[PDB]
């Protein structure tokens, strides 16, 4: 013996592997279908019908019931983005990049875009709110270490837009998700923690510029910050990087973006 066998050198071990690739090949198929719940339904438009196409190995749904009085959601993307975008053609073959119809950031298109998202504060385990201002919660306390509260936030150009006032924290997961900037006009605006550096001497926002600051879309409400506003602040904050430094392109290198 050297591997017992059935019909023509096809052993019990041989049986095992043909069977494996017989159904795993199917697994990929399933999870790939399951993977395209969103997006993939409607990339075709009825200005003219189908002779071109819209892929459809697409699955049969179920419904995510949102705990918080939220409701029921069917994710197979019945998507109709009802918002506007400032963009238009630059040639007729769809792969070509198609320009912003006048500055992005103010109306968000390109790398600095936000998106509609049920205009209500994020789910906590408890019905309570999630992200809540440090100046308003049961004992949260950065101890002896550099809480940026009394130092000027500063962008690319100058430190003349930098009254830091209070950290803005996530209550369950204990993380400081926001720094609050009382802009030179008593306007509190927040910034996404990751995109700013806190040197024990100043807060550097290599993300944006001294200006462009007084634009981060106001959280029009004092305490409750939220999606339509949360995806918006980060969105316009991102508008630095690509669209900030006037220099519309440039080879790069390690240390702070080209510096000065």
């Amino acid at each position: 013996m050297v591997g017992v066998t059935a019909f023509g050198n096809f052993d019990l071990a041989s049986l095992a592997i043909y069977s494996f690739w017989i159904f795993l090949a199917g697994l990929i198929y399933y999870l790939q279908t399951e993977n395209m719940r969103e997006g993939y339904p409607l990339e075709n438009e009825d200005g003219t019908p189908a002779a071109n196409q819209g892929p459809f190995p697409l699955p049969k749904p179920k419904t995510f019931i949102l705990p918080h009085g939220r409701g029921t959601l069917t994710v197979p993307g019945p998507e109709s983005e009802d918002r506007p975008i400032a963009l238009a053609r630059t040639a007729v073959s769809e792969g070509f990049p198609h320009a912003p119809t006048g500055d992005p950031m103010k109306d968000g298109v390109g790398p600095a875009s936000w998106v509609a998202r049920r205009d209500l504060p994020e789910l906590d385990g408890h019905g309570h709110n999630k992200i809540k201002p440090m100046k308003a919660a049961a004992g949260f306390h950065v101890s002896a270490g550099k809480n940026p509260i009394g130092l000027p936030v500063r962008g690319c150009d100058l430190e003349i837009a930098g009254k830091v006032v209070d950290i803005w924290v996530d209550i369950p997961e204990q993380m400081a998700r926001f720094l609050e900037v009382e802009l030179k006009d008593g306007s509190t605006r927040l910034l996404p923690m990751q995109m700013v550096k806190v040197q024990s001497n100043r807060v550097h926002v290599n993300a944006l510029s001294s200006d462009l600051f007084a634009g981060i879309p106001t959280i029009k409400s004092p305490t409750e910050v939220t999606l339509l506003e949360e995806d918006k602040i980060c969105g316009y904050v991102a508008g630095g990087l690509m669209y900030a430094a006037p220099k519309r392109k440039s080879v790069v290198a390690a240390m702070l973006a080209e510096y000065a």
Partner: protein, 273 residues
């Protein structure tokens, strides 16, 4: 592709040297300078490989490969069959890689995200290069590397593995294997951890963050939150890949004769016989 949402975000930018020219989604893909500079730098590798094969034998997937120049064949990029095809598959390949790597920085950049994946990728290159152009260059014989061939590159692994005894005993392997292992643990756990939440027992509520964070606390007696585990994500697996490469670059040189004899030092220290 056309990925519905895509529509908006499809704008110019990025590009390290492809200025404005050479940045148009060839269908679902993104042709950028490096995008082409991969394809060329790549294909000229497939052609070189495909042909080189038509001078040694059978037109078969699982039966060719690529052996470097002999051992004391010096170093100097010798013949175009007795190991030079390798050096022209490598410079071609290594390049193709480095390109796709930085290509990501391009695409990544023009979408506001952060140059973070290629970093995690630069470790895979750091790996390859150790056992192809680092370990070999050390002791001159550009044979100590490995032949690109499917069923035949497993053989190098063994023929060099046992050249040192039972490689197991070799250090790095040990702690490096630990992270490779522990990678699975992580994901496996994170792999259920949200699908469990996202999908709870029948007509119940979509168990949210807190529950993830409790369950684990409520089992291991700890949970690292939601950013926490996606941190380990690199560190665990990636450090594995780093540590793995130590496993070899050292063996050649820092220590020659058979392992099982290193760990013999602890076994002897004065006080202990």
């Amino acid at each position: 592709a056309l990925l519905s949402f895509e529509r908006k975000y499809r704008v110019p930018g990025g590009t390290l040297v492809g200025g404005n020219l050479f940045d148009f989604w060839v269908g679902p893909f993104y042709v950028g300078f490096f995008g082409v500079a991969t394809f060329f730098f790549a294909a000229l590798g497939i052609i070189l490989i495909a042909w080189s094969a038509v001078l040694q034998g059978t037109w078969n997937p699982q039966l060719i490969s690529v052996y470097p120049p002999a051992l004391e064949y010096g170093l100097g990029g010798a013949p175009l069959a007795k190991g030079g095809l390798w050096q022209i598959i490598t410079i071609c390949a290594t390049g193709a890689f480095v390109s796709w790597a930085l290509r990501e920085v391009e695409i990544c950049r023009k979408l506001g995200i952060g140059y973070h994946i290629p970093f995690a990728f630069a470790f895979a290159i750091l790996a390859y290069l150790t056992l192809v152009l680092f370990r070999p260059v050390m002791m001159g014989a550009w044979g100590y590397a490995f032949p690109y061939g499917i069923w035949t590159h497993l053989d190098w692994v063994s023929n060099t593995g046992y050249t040192y005894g039972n490689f197991h005993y070799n250090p790095a392997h040990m702690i490096a294997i630990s992270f490779f292992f522990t990678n699975a643990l992580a994901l496996a756990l994170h792999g259920a951890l949200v699908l469990s939440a996202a999908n709870p027992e029948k007509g119940k509520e979509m168990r949210t963050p807190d529950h993830e964070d409790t369950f684990f606390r409520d089992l291991v007696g700890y949970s690292i939150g939601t950013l926490g585990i996606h941190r380990l994500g690199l560190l665990l697996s990636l450090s594995a890949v780093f540590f793995s490469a130590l496993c070899m670059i050292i063996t050649g040189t820092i220590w020659f004769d058979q392992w099982v004899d290193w760990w013999q030092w602890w076994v002897k220290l004065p006080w202990w016989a």
